[PDB]
Design an enzyme around this catalytic site. Structure first.
Site, mmCIF file in Angstrom:
data_model
loop_
_atom_site.group_PDB
_atom_site.id
_atom_site.type_symbol
_atom_site.label_atom_id
_atom_site.label_comp_id
_atom_site.label_asym_id
_atom_site.label_seq_id
_atom_site.Cartn_x
_atom_site.Cartn_y
_atom_site.Cartn_z
ATOM 1 N N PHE A 108 -1.775 16.319 4.303
ATOM 2 C CA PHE A 108 -2.013 15.697 3.001
ATOM 3 C C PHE A 108 -0.765 15.782 2.111
ATOM 4 O O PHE A 108 -0.258 16.877 1.843
ATOM 5 C CB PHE A 108 -3.213 16.343 2.298
ATOM 6 C CG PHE A 108 -3.676 15.576 1.101
ATOM 7 C CD1 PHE A 108 -4.543 14.514 1.241
ATOM 8 C CD2 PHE A 108 -3.222 15.897 -0.162
ATOM 9 C CE1 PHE A 108 -4.958 13.779 0.125
ATOM 10 C CE2 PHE A 108 -3.634 15.168 -1.269
ATOM 11 C CZ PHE A 108 -4.490 14.114 -1.124
ATOM 12 N N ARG B 210 1.047 12.056 -9.523
ATOM 13 C CA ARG B 210 1.567 10.687 -9.464
ATOM 14 C C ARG B 210 2.964 10.634 -10.142
ATOM 15 O O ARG B 210 3.867 9.909 -9.698
ATOM 16 C CB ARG B 210 0.594 9.686 -10.095
ATOM 17 C CG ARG B 210 -0.749 9.579 -9.349
ATOM 18 C CD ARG B 210 -1.394 8.260 -9.676
ATOM 19 N NE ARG B 210 -2.836 8.201 -9.451
ATOM 20 C CZ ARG B 210 -3.417 7.860 -8.304
ATOM 21 N NH1 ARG B 210 -2.682 7.585 -7.216
ATOM 22 N NH2 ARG B 210 -4.754 7.800 -8.231
ATOM 23 N N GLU C 79 0.845 -1.189 0.000
ATOM 24 C CA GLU C 79 0.000 0.000 0.000
ATOM 25 C C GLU C 79 0.890 1.253 0.000
ATOM 26 O O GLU C 79 2.073 1.196 0.410
ATOM 27 C CB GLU C 79 -0.873 -0.039 1.267
ATOM 28 C CG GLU C 79 -1.976 0.977 1.372
ATOM 29 C CD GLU C 79 -2.935 0.922 0.203
ATOM 30 O OE1 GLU C 79 -2.566 1.457 -0.857
ATOM 31 O OE2 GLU C 79 -4.046 0.357 0.345
ATOM 32 N N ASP C 80 0.330 2.377 -0.446
ATOM 33 C CA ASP C 80 1.038 3.651 -0.413
ATOM 34 C C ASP C 80 0.947 4.290 0.980
ATOM 35 O O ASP C 80 1.960 4.729 1.518
ATOM 36 C CB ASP C 80 0.500 4.634 -1.490
ATOM 37 C CG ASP C 80 -1.039 4.791 -1.458
ATOM 38 O OD1 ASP C 80 -1.717 3.995 -0.774
ATOM 39 O OD2 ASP C 80 -1.586 5.704 -2.136
#
Ligand SMILES: Nc1nc(=O)c2ncn(CC(COCP(=O)(O)O)COCP(=O)(O)O)c2[nH]1
Ligand SMILES: Nc1nc(=O)c2ncn(CC(COCP(=O)(O)O)COCP(=O)(O)O)c2[nH]1
Ligand SMILES: Nc1nc(=O)c2ncn(CC(COCP(=O)(O)O)COCP(=O)(O)O)c2[nH]1
Ligand SMILES: Nc1nc(=O)c2ncn(CC(COCP(=O)(O)O)COCP(=O)(O)O)c2[nH]1
Ligand SMILES: [Mg+2]
Ligand SMILES: [Mg+2]
Ligand SMILES: [Mg+2]
Ligand SMILES: [Mg+2]
Ligand SMILES: [Mg+2]
Ligand SMILES: [Mg+2]
Ligand SMILES: [Mg+2]
Ligand SMILES: [Mg+2]
Lengths: 203, 198, 205, 204
Positions: free
Chosen positions: C174, C187, C121-122
């Protein structure tokens, strides 16, 4: 092994298939050994060195200038093993240039040590032969020679290094720190010079 | 270009000259394309893509599962250009598997990234599906294209290597899901075909 | 043990690194340099093999955010496998998560039965999603299931789930980059970074 | 640019967060600058170098032994820049060791008329670079610039500031990434601080 054997008839690659510095676009005939292939072979070489000299301190001796890239990359691969395994090769380093050994620490610093000499290319083998005789006089515990390239030539004196990347035909190669009058060291691929390259950078 | 042409009589390399995973020692015959050669060729492809798509946003579309390594690596070389040049290809990414809503491709510049084209039938099929959504433009990059009389005549825009009609694995290409965890492209041995057969 | 990034971590000026030209006005600071992620990932790979190296591993990439971490983490595992005495085959799979959690695009999860399953997972934030995926996976009797996450957030919103393998433990901020997105953007950025106000407005949906 | 500034009270990283050579496990205290961070910064340095020096044939001079890793990596990034456009310039390389006596290089006349980039591991007092520079300028290079991975903040400074700086660090003794303590710790990818046991074990 004799290393990765490149046949006499191998055509190498069109330069257009790779990224090449524009300042050498007309100076090279073909790409002969792509950088990434040198890296893949060098990875296996590091493991062979670890197998033969692992678990003992090594002095890694770089023969400048042409050996510098192969040296840095081979040592990087050995360091990768050292940090991902329980068995290690603690290393120190030194650098020499051949004229007559130029620069470098006292060769007496080699006495009683395990020495790995790192070279770009063996052609006649005369030079490495002479270097070995000299180094041997200082009574190292052991000496091995890694050479990225070994040339197939009738002028061969018969010297074989302990570790060899590629065995190549009798053609003048440049790139990966190997030069022609100091040029082409800034080229990551091993290549064959063109006629115009030889004329342009002729001494 | 047709890419790096590999001859029908290319012998490949003795496994003993490279680092290969132990659990595959008996299951491969030769290394066919060294990982590093793939990287070198991919670096040039990224520059070709930049030359052809350079001034625009693209959606990079990865064809899973086999295309995953080539995709990551090709995009890494494109990003290297993006951050070291005033020329830039801004990218978004998507994935699909054949054996997100393609509506999101409408009016977009699309770069499809594939591991291998054999007959070309799969790619034509994928292309006809994408075109249903009226993309602005569609280009295809394939690491490998097979030389084969069975080709329908479809050719990709970007090609890494043109290879003989031999069954290859590695660099994410599999045989029954095995051999994906192999950095080099290789030719499978008889014991490997039998060990891993479905 | 995760690298702990403090609440007051100032990150780095963008001008000290190379960053994509099209994002020059869109980022505030580099938060976690690419190189640092690689160094930490090298060590995670080793931890993973030490724990899971004993049996066939199935590595599950959680798209899309997980794809970069997945590729690099597997590269380091492969480097281990080809330079060591003992070795185990790894197979791979890719999945996307969707609320009706529903698993999209994987192989049949029966392929998971009896295997050592590594989920990649990121980022774990509230961790509700991973907690749900795990319950799912456990229905198929994997031999073992472990989770590797590049990032884990320190957040009061946590349900209390902590992954087995963690790259970096970060503040409740974030972040984008290294395949983590903001509305599909960012990305294509190697570093983990914080977005600028102009970035937020530009790419806001 | 003063480079990436590392504070006086930067604690660096626990060794357990990284892969460390087995044989140095007891000999280091902390990782100070991770290898990856060095690479990221080096990539940006390469771009800055080409922006200033890319107009004419560059001669890159590596100051051995400690500059060797930074030199190899810096040049790799420069080469990458030079093969991904249509605009490039030739680069040649030389290697020297410093004793105002330069050991083991080519004749300094080979520097005349060139863009010379001197590559160093660290500047501390700065005395060595200033002296080197004073000599090199007498061969009339087209230009001479200095890139140094590390520059120390120290009141002992002679006031020399290199043109390209990787990191500006506190007055602490560091090893790794080819920087040594009595020839040890060159075979280490990260820049780190030695432990007490390491310092006594390898003391000359
Ligand atoms: N760059 C290069 N490419 C070759 O194909 C090649 N084939 C032989 N040689 C000579 C090589 C090494 O050959 C020496 P030897 O015949 O093994 O004693 C470079 O020598 C250093 P320099 O004083 O010429 O700069 C070559 N050098
Ligand atoms: N792994 C692999 N190696 C090949 O040499 C090769 N040559 C052709 N193919 C089939 C290829 C691609 O060729 C498809 P097409 O004939 O161009 O439509 C991909 O494998 C997909 P799947 O069988 O797992 O569903 C190959 N697959
Ligand atoms: N890009 C990103 N950066 C964050 O810092 C961050 N913190 C939490 N999240 C939400 C993330 C990860 O956290 C989810 P969870 O609370 O652990 O279940 C999910 O991303 C999917 P989507 O937004 O494309 O639908 C984040 N996503
Ligand atoms: N390895 C190392 N780490 C340091 O933190 C450090 N700080 C200063 N220095 C000395 C440095 C810097 O000295 C040059 P200067 O003070 O800038 O004139 C070079 O070391 C060479 P040597 O002692 O092996 O002959 C250091 N060397
Ligand atoms: Mg030589
Ligand atoms: Mg020469
Ligand atoms: Mg495919
Ligand atoms: Mg398949
Ligand atoms: Mg995620
Ligand atoms: Mg999203
Ligand atoms: Mg120095
Ligand atoms: Mg020293």
């Amino acid at each position: 092994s004799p290393g990765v054997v490149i046949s006499d008839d191998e055509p190498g690659y069109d330069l257009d298939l790779f990224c090449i510095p524009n300042h050498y676009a007309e100076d090279l005939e073909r790409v002969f050994i792509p950088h990434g292939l040198i890296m893949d072979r060098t990875e296996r070489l590091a493991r062979d060195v670890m197998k033969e000299m692992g678990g003992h301190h090594i002095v890694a001796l770089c023969v400048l200038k042409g050996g510098y890239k192969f040296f840095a990359d081979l040592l990087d691969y050995i360091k990768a093993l050292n940090r991902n395994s329980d068995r290690s090769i603690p290393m120190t380093v030194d650098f020499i240039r051949l004229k007559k050994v130029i620069g470098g620490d006292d060769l007496s610093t080699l006495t009683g040590k395990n020495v790995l000499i790192v070279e770009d290319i063996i052609d006649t083998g005369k030079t490495m032969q002479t270097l070995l005789s000299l180094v041997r006089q200082y009574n190292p515990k052991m000496v091995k020679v890694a050479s990225l390239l070994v040339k197939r030539t009738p002028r061969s004196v018969g010297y074989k290094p302990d570790f060899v990347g590629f065995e190549i035909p009798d053609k003048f190669v440049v790139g990966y720190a190997l030069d022609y009058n100091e040029y082409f060291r800034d080229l990551n691929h091993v290549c064959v010079i063109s006629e115009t390259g030889k004329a342009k950078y002729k001494a």
